[PDB]
């Protein structure tokens, strides 16, 4: 089996997006495949409590039938990091908990993606990040690229911390968040370049993908 | 005397907007300042040849009448990363050259501000970053934070890093680069708790300021 997280090099660079391609990836190379998003904030209401829209996603696109509480189990309203909503809603979030969900789509699944929730030190509480979870668990990092001014930095510090943490940082994937621009091929040449993983894939610009193409054939899971 | 290397978290976080407080705070406390941008990308055609605006503001904000090219002495048009218009343009980047105008500073100036050219992994070639030459001139390093989505982790990643290089982190400044909004205090106490830099001050937000009004009474440089 296999199990993944990934993470992006700055807000809006279509993290989940990416994630919903590896997913579709693996589902037609055979895997049985989950999404997990254990925490998210910015959600909305439902008769059946609140719902994120990237846990969703990660749900409809995993190839099991899975319930949105397997997906994500700690659900906040507020767009916000979430050691603040947390908090403010007497509602702790406990890395035992985050690690039993997984093990739970393992039961299941043998291809796992993790998404976590905003960027890599994102606090949970106080004194916990995400990346210190991320770490204990040991998971290969996947890197999304945000194909933009300033890509080429945050994706060498993102780069350099999870390498520091001693985890594998198993590929990234370039993420067309805007129409193409004049330096594109160069940029990419270069990202290739710095980025100490493989070069999974393209994601072209797909105007926020209202019909919902499949996006799975950009990935070649064979690189990973 | 002294010496500081400016950077900020993200793209668009008002990174020259802090210089120019820094600056006029270091005036106010009685320094002979001076800024220096020695590379710069993205300026405008005049007759004297291209001028890039981050640079102006900095020679506008030194207590010195310093001449452009003392300020900036690499100049391109195109808004790109230094590494693809230099090649482009046939115009190599010399470290020692950019060593030598930080010299010719400190020839009249008893406080410089040092600013790149994008955040701190900016090639300048294909082989050497802007990192590479701060960590050369053993520069302490201010961080500049925009109060945004995902500024924690954007601010953890790069005070890692700079730290691992063996740098000092001299200090950080808050820029509020949007209105106000509802988690300002708590962003600013988890900031102010996980980056390892006294905080020196926070700058409202001015609506890009256009008439220049005073910024460096928001700057403690006893902090420094």
Request: include cysteine; charge should be negative; hydrophobic fraction near 40%.
């Amino acid at each position: 089996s296999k199990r993944y997280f990934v993470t992006g090099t700055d807000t809006e660079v279509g993290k989940t997006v990416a994630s919903c391609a590896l997913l579709q990836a693996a589902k037609a190379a055979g895997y049985r495949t989950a999404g997990y998003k254990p925490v998210a904030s910015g959600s909305e209401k439902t008769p059946e409590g609140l719902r994120n829209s990237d846990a969703l996603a990660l749900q409809r696109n995993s190839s099991l039938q899975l319930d949105y509480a397997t997906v994500n189990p700690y659900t906040f309203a507020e767009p916000t990091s979430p050691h603040i909503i947390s908090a403010q809603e007497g509602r702790p979030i406990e890395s035992l908990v985050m690690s039993a969900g997984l093990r739970a789509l393992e039961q299941q699944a043998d291809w796992v993606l993790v998404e976590g929730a905003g960027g890599w030190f994102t606090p949970l509480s106080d004194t916990f990040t995400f990346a210190d979870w991320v770490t204990q668990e040991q998971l290969p990092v996947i890197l999304v690229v945000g194909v933009k001014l300033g890509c080429i930095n945050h994706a060498m510090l993102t780069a350099q911390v999870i390498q520091h943490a001693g985890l594998t940082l198993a590929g990234w994937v370039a993420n067309d968040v805007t129409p193409p621009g004049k330096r594109h091929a160069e940029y990419m040449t270069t990202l290739t370049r710095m980025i100490p993983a493989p070069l999974l894939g393209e994601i072209p610009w797909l105007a926020e993908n209202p019909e919902n193409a499949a996006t799975g054939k950009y990935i070649n899971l064979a690189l990973l």
